[PDB]
Design a protein around this ligand. Structure first.
Ligand SMILES: *[C@@H]1O[C@H](CO)[C@@H](O)[C@H](O)[C@H]1NC(C)=O
Ligand SMILES: *[C@@H]1O[C@H](CO)[C@@H](O)[C@H](O)[C@H]1NC(C)=O
Ligand SMILES: *[C@@H]1O[C@H](CO)[C@@H](O)[C@H](O)[C@H]1NC(C)=O
Ligand SMILES: *[C@@H]1O[C@H](CO)[C@@H](O)[C@H](O)[C@H]1NC(C)=O
Lengths: 497, 497, 497, 497
């Protein structure tokens, strides 16, 4: 149940060093006894998911901040938490010695780690690949007779995915996203740039691209991997832009609507993988609510869409209410999902920044707002990167929660990995968000959920320099008195009955 | 046969576009009667090994530079020319349809092409792989019972080498270099960075490593391939710098010496592959004379070393006289061989420049400098690359004589390909370098060689923009009046009897 | 007078080349008889503010889009148009030989130019300086006795502003904005990064800061310049980001309010420059409605606030209706102003793209959108930049309408310059925006407005590849049949009596 | 006399942190008493120029290492040590609060710092400028009527130069170098790329460029700065290379020869600044001895050259015997001077690496070798850089002994600053190098010199892990017993009489 081993790389906080024989970890999880709460803390100063336990008192006299649970107010059920098995992530992980590979995967996927239950798999290459390739690169192969998985799947991604699922006790859901199609299906003849599918929904190009999905699933299935969902297309808006630098395939909302309706919906249904769900959008949430309007108000497309997938860059800011909120209002039965998230780049920073507390707080802060607005799940980008933040074929640099230093056979767990963990570890699939009324204006972000077994979890992130005394109230049991240290993140759990 | 189909990409000269059905090629070559010479010409302006004939007549009306063949001054015999069959070149070649594959192979290995007769083979992965593996990654296998060939070998490298050999009429020698040992023989337990073999020459580790070389040979023999030679280590000096990003394995001059004396030599000699030869260094020529002084002034080491392998990459930090020149002088019975003849060069430039005359000239100039200073052979780097210069699992940095474009089922033959060919096609194994005296100081680079059958070849690179009028005298035959245009390279051929 | 000399730099359109002796310009504009309209046209293909005339005819042959002037619907009045006299632009301008200087200035401030009537003028350094500095760098001068103007002001900015004025027939309004205070009033003792004023609104730090605005206005008064307005701080949100690289100065909405009330308002009002107005925010529209909610609901703050200044950055992150639109509603007697208009975005793009029609469109599209959501004026960023998009002491990131090449004593007028001119030349101060109803869903952006003398002016923008037939109806006059070419921007003008 | 405040940034060693109120520094220097040695040490594990003192024993009993001072073998006299006041250095330092600026300058230039006596000054912009610009950009200004210093000289470079000279006891020597001429004197008409001086030496182009040097010198003189020496040109080999990215101006050796002979030499001689020495070359030592041969074997050129300037790239390796060795041999009376040194990225390998011992070692192992082969002086590149290695207008990336953090108003002294200091501080101007023979093969790099007053210094660097015990012998005085801890650098000082 070993503790963190800290190193400062000169920024606001430390990272935790793992290596072939040592990684920080958890005792197998356990519930506190009735009358008591558990609290996990992580701070800028260096505390990393330290377990302390406390009393639920029957009394409180104001008037510090009070957060009141409203066990009555239901909201979204919760799908899960996870990240992406990008080519680069696979590569960095396999470049470490076997035993360090497992401490790596346990960190993410074990119950002794942060219990991830989602993995996003790209369908052939993205920008975290070291070459551009699709699974059907033979020109005019409308039948897809030359469709095959390269080594990047059969040797890197796929094996790693089996390993991850073995380590994990929680069932894991796989999510696929393609970035680009073969270039012979694309008006512009290249993996990138402006350009969309050739022709017209309904036609041969469109039928082929949809069969391509079934092939992807067929091929993955002979390796004993099944998918929970696919998405219609990564960042479809990206491919509508002149000079776009990585792999992509443009869709306007109309094009996407028609593609799903006339092609991808039916092709999926007629195949043995009909159970696989489909998500639309997979893009920046500012395209909302309009993108959903367009697609979903067509019953032909709607019978086919299970949910809407969104992205955010965390250095930036959207309102949320106007997007996710409004979207929920209009389509309260099509689940919002965050399918990709990540931090820049500033530009004055510096893609990987080892031990940055800021980048930690943005993850949690964005996870909180997302849960506050009906989002059922949250997927990180690359599971691992190197210290340059690659490999990337096109030099697009971003950070990752785990950083691999192949030359030292070590890997660093970043603050990000831990703010992610405050949720991933304590909110299993099934959890239902429920209400949490603040007694008054405050700087804290907080959120409450209930496990499938009635029990309670609350996450509190504090982004001020100042400490904030506070009480959480729960009617069925009482008051919890605590502090949120400035620059802290806490998770509280307690039994209710 | 078929001529070069030119495409430009906005660099100084053009590439020859080949695809599945068309590729530029040569006729079986044909040598005229006494008094007549053949001349093959390539020019920045676009000419590509264009054949033409002329007279060698008895009066001499050149009044400019004279170059006189001096067959009685005889220097080194040529082992030959080739390139490397890295993981990355096998992927790129295998991503063309079969018919385009054979035109690529015919291009290099057939006598319709440029008649390569050497292939350098990595033993397990380097940075031109898509993943970091060795042939025995299973720890504590000091007898290497789990030693085996992955799919890179058994499914990409071996079948490509078989095909190269069916195509070549000339015998082809194979040369092998390791980049790294299993990580569990290394001081640092990492595929890269600073790290040597564990312990010291003699011990269980050095013996295991030495054995790995044999296991490798055994394995390839099962696939019916024999090596001409192996190198002691690819860039042993790299393995001594902290943070080196590529696969390496460190040896000081002194350590390499003892690994050869104590371990490598005795092991090979004691094996059924004792006939395979051993090349030392495999590194930058700036490391010479020294590295040779340390290894060869010890008779236990020297007795097993046949040759000294050099890389071109650096070189501008030398020049030839101090390094190759001096090494010959000191050890005139140890042959000098260019094992990694490469540069994608100048920091402000892309890895791949399609159609760059500068880089084609860089190749030829330095084959000329190398022949004038005793070198007996040239291995280019990667047979083929994608247009990024990859795949490389780390960073791209280098060009290749052939660029493959999978999306288009086409490949491009760079000026480089032809500057190699002006030598590789007309200097069969066994050819001997012979003297060639300039009547006056000139800006051209010229070498003369004599074939085994006695017939004469001269190559004249012109790296300036001005046409140089030129005569070549063969005392046996007469005078050859000609011109070397700006930015041209000529190969002359004639019978002497 | 003289037409445009086009030059291409391999982007979608041309620049107009201008030097010491030639530069493209206009005749005094010339209003025609009733029943006749003037149209000025620019197009991606090469037309630049080309004048043609036609009839407004009482019958309506048009059958496509109809746009109908509705003079009875009246909205905001227009303050005007301009850009910033940063250090970078004063330098680029003053490195042209005098005769070329005046044609650059005529180009912007003349009525044979585009009739700028606003200049924004930083108060000491920002990033578009060559070095950092304030007007009182000598610590503990709480009375600012050692306050003075450097050469950047007294030698470059000021004289260049005098000549923009001499040249302009329209009154020109000056707007001033600080980036940072003396670093001895800051929490962090640095010209940048995270950090605010020290202590509390009310205190000696806030008092001294407020005095600095006056001391500035004093300084410029002595050079006979007077300001229309000042902003409270350039991008105040920025100073709340750790390691923000440019000169900033942090204010929370709450802190800005308090500083306006206690210090900035009284001090200006209690001074001989009581007439100068104050603009709040000067920041990304994303911060609205909130920022004005916080400042303007306090009657002590609000009585001193004339206007809310917005930046165009940081615009994709928010729709206009949610921001500008929602803000007007809430505070419909506070004007909206665009104080910094900016493009050079798309990370994978060079900062300056010579002759890019796309960036031109981004300007006009966004002036249209602004105008439809109540904005009264615009200030572009830098008046001039070098081809690097510097001088900038931090990093170059942005384009400018006029790019200066010192080495050729020439400057280029970008597509941007004309898209701005399609507005700034024909919409004098005092012009009022009026309604314009599309007969049907379309792709054009259009805005209609009414000069003080009540003549009509209409801009139409076509961000599409295809020609759009168009009729424009003035109920008072008749119909204007016309076509809006793909990738074109039109300005129409007609008498209404 | 305050000690070092250490920060780790995660690499092999610490930096010393300075700020507005605190900087590590020395006491005024002290004569050690006869009988004793002084020893300054700096270590990988964190010691920074710690003083200790010790006994000179009269006896020793050998077998370990012994290095014997040969006070009689005299070698080169020493000119000095210093760095370059680039635009980027000037501005990073002027960005700090005024008192942090003095601690910075004191560290380099004060006698309680590391004793710099050289400042190299670029003549107009180089790559560590934020805009390209010469002192005469008015096209065809052959008379040089528009020649003037821009602010970068007047407000950044010059003021600091005064301030550094005021803080230094030792006379400081200024060294000027141009990178580029006005573009209208250059065949290609650009600040960069391939291209040299128009026409032929003797002509107006050539004669103007030389007058440009006197102009530079006149203008500098108006500001009371006199120059010790000027170089004919920075990296003249650079401007002969197609597409070279920063400011350059190519010369072949003959061009340089004839430029100096026909123009630069006489022009300078005819001027009031005839006292100013002139160094040729200013480029990679690879060009040796060939470049010296060409210039100096022409009497007309040679009467004008005072010394030869060399550059080294510290990531790489040149031999030196063959370059500097020979060059001395041929021209013992024209001094050798290193005008620029720097560590790039080792290209994998960020440009600033805070706390790198390696890069520290490369400085000293370099300085020692320069010292061993006749060099009189040694000048570092940029005095100060930001953490990104800039600002650079072109992104060329290198490290610096001092990294400035403008936002924290701090600065870091890197290991490099201290390997520099071990020489700069203790080898005043006029010191003479003398012999030092090792009793036996070792790894230590060492060197010994004699102060002008008679006294001794030796420096010993240890680049192995192992500690090496050793004795230094001086005949006149006795034996010094000591260790050289692995990864350490010592300097020893003793009076002799
Ligand atoms: C791995 O980590 C543990 C804990 O820091 C440490 O004691 C050990 O030295 C490390 N092993 C290696 C190979 O560095
Ligand atoms: C290959 O190239 C030849 C000549 O350029 C051309 O005629 C033919 O169309 C090409 N083959 C294909 C399949 O494009
Ligand atoms: C200025 O531009 C005009 C038109 O391009 C041209 O006729 C003239 O040569 C230019 N002037 C100079 C000094 O180059
Ligand atoms: C800078 O100097 C010392 C060094 O540790 C420190 O105690 C002091 O507080 C620092 N000053 C600032 C402004 O941080």
């Amino acid at each position: 149940a070993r503790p963190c081993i800290p190193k400062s790389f000169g920024y606001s906080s430390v990272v935790c060093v793992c290596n072939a024989t040592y990684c920080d970890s958890f005792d197998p999880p356990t519930f506190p006894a009735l009358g008591t709460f558990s609290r996990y803390e992580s701070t800028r100063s260096g505390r990393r998911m330290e377990l302390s336990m406390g009393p639920i008192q029957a009394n409180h006299t104001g008037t510090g901040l009070l957060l009141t649970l409203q066990p009555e107010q239901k909201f979204q059920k919760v799908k899960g938490f996870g990240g992406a098995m990008t080519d680069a992530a696979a590569l960095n992980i396999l470049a470490l010695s076997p035993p360090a590979q497992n401490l790596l995967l346990k960190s993410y996927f074990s119950e002794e780690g942060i219990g991830y239950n989602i993995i996003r798999v790209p369908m052939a290459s993205c920008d975290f690949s070291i070459r551009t390739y699709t699974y059907a690169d033979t020109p005019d192969d409308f039948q897809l007779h030359n469709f095959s998985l390269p080594e990047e799947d059969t040797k890197l991604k796929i094996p790693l995915i089996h390993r991850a699922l073995q380590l994990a006790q929680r069932p894991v859901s796989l999510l696929a996203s393609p970035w680009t199609s073969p270039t012979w299906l694309k008006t512009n003849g290249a993996v990138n740039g402006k350009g969309s599918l050739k022709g017209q929904p309904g036609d041969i190009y469109h039928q082929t691209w949809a069969r391509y999905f079934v092939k992807f699933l067929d091929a993955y299935a002979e390796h004993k991997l099944q998918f929970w969902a696919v998405t219609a297309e990564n960042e479809p808006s990206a491919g509508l832009l002149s000079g776009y630098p990585f792999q992509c395939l443009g869709f306007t909302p109309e094009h996407q609507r028609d593609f799903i309706a006339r092609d991808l919906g039916p092709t999926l249904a007629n195949s043995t993988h009909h159970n696989v769900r489909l998500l639309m959008l997979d893009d920046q949430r500012l395209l909302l609510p309009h993108w959903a309007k367009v697609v979903l108000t067509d019953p032909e497309a709607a019978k086919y869409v299970h949910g809407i997938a969104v992205h955010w860059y965390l250095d930036f800011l959207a309102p949320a209410k106007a997007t996710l909120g409004e979207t929920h209002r209009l389509f309260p039965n099509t689940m919002l999902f965050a399918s990709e998230a990540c931090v820049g780049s500033k530009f004055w920073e510096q893609s990987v920044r080892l031990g940055s507390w800021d980048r930690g707080m943005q993850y949690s802060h964005s996870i909180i707002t997302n849960l506050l607005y009906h989002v059922v799940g949250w997927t990180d980008w690359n599971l691992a990167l190197n210290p340059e933040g690659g490999p990337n074929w096109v030099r697009n640099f971003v950070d990752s929660p785990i950083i691999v230093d192949i030359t030292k056979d070590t890997f660093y767990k970043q603050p990000m990995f831990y703010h992610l963990g405050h949720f991933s570890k304590f909110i299993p699939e099934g959890s239902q968000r429920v209400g949490l009324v603040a007694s008054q204006k405050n700087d804290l972000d907080a959120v409450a959920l209930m496990h499938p077994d009635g029990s309670a979890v609350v996450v509190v992130l504090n982004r001020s320099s100042k400490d904030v005394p506070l009480t959480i109230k729960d009617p069925a049991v009482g008051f919890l008195e605590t502090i949120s240290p400035g620059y802290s993140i806490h998770t509280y759990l307690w039994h209710r009955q």
